[model samples]
Target: QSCLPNWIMHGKSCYLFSFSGNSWYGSKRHCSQLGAHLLKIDNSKEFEFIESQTSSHRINAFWIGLSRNQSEGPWFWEDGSAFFPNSFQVRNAVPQESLLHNCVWIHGSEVYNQICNTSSYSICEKE
Candidate 1:
């Protein structure tokens, strides 16, 4: 199916780089409202596409579909896909004063964890 207006098509999915910032939960809700989910990078090619989109703009970072519980555990995508070990690239952990940062976002080609309640732009995706 064709993507909606302002959405970019790459491979079999459509992506929306939401300029408006929101908390991770709010961002996920926004995508759900549009029948999508927070963007999930499943492969190198898809990651490259998202990298290109984010680089073309001046955004510092944008939330992705990966997250975990407040406690130590496995991370999963918004679509309920579990992240396999070494499946994606993530930056060195910069210890946060607060341990509440359970949401993941893309900054450049590296992924970082941040507080889910912090407002930031989001990347929404759908098949």
Candidate 2:
């Protein structure tokens, strides 16, 4: 069966979207089991596409390719890329917030936190 819905596609290096339902880790494993990984925004165009798609229905917050800094000061993406303020909608650099969780989400209206194992909708990528 097709891994993702018809609304998504495989871009330059991966497929991507902002999941409305899954927690950080559960979303990751869900994608892995489907032979794909959580959505990764490699560039501005892809990022814009994701934003456009999720912006529909005025949905504010959703999960993406960001994670907590479990042992460090800064968070990182799934592909080991450092978080960029220019690319992220919310870029808070408070150290005390770093150790609170190990997963991240893109929330514009409000802050949404979830563990890495809750089941919800997700975006996926495959090579």
Candidate 3:
């Protein structure tokens, strides 16, 4: 397994990033290798902290804590969290019943779909 990247930290039950530049899957794997996963902010305060950190570096988008499990509507975190009460889904971008898209991230504007291997910047979190 790889060590955690410098731009991230293991917070209470999550991994946090202070930068941006990763595709959905790359970010997830980076976290997995570190025995963690991408950050999962379930409240406004957490989102604010992430936004502050990401904006400081002027990164437009960075992967967050959600993805499809090869089965639509069954979204899950790399850390095995459920999707009933998602906190960061983009407005009108929720997963469809049969659609293949399944991942989450944050940008200045909206959320977007990204392949797993495309590398950018990433953060890792742990308990």
Top of the candidates by lDDT: 1
Query: Among these predicted structures, which one has the highest TM-score?
Result: 1
- TM-score, cand. 2: 0.65
TM values, all candidates: 0.90, 0.65, 0.63
- The window of 10 residues in a row where model 3 has the poorest summed lDDT is 1-10
Candidate 2 lDDT, tens digit per residue, 30-74? 677777777766667766766665556344456666777564556
- Tell me the tens digit of each residue's lDDT in model 3 across 1-127: 3334454332344455635455666677667777776766666666666776667655556777767756336666665777655445554444554344456666653455454545556556676
For model 2, name the residue pairs that clash: 21-120, 22-120, 25-116, 26-116
Q: What CA RMSD would you report for each candidate?
A: 1.7, 4.5, 5.0
* Residue ranges of candidate 1 with Cα displaced over 4 Å: 85-87
Question: How far out, in Å, is residue 35 in model 2?
Answer: 1.2
Kindly give the stretch of ten consecutive residues in candidate 2 with the minimal lDDT sum. 106-115
Decide which is better by lDDT, 1 or 3. 1
lDDT of 1 by residue, 1-127 (tens): 7889999988989999998989999999999999999998888788778887777764478998899886477789887888864546555475746667789988776688888998999999989
| Residue ranges of candidate 2 with Cα displaced over 4 Å | 1-7, 13-20, 93-98, 108-120
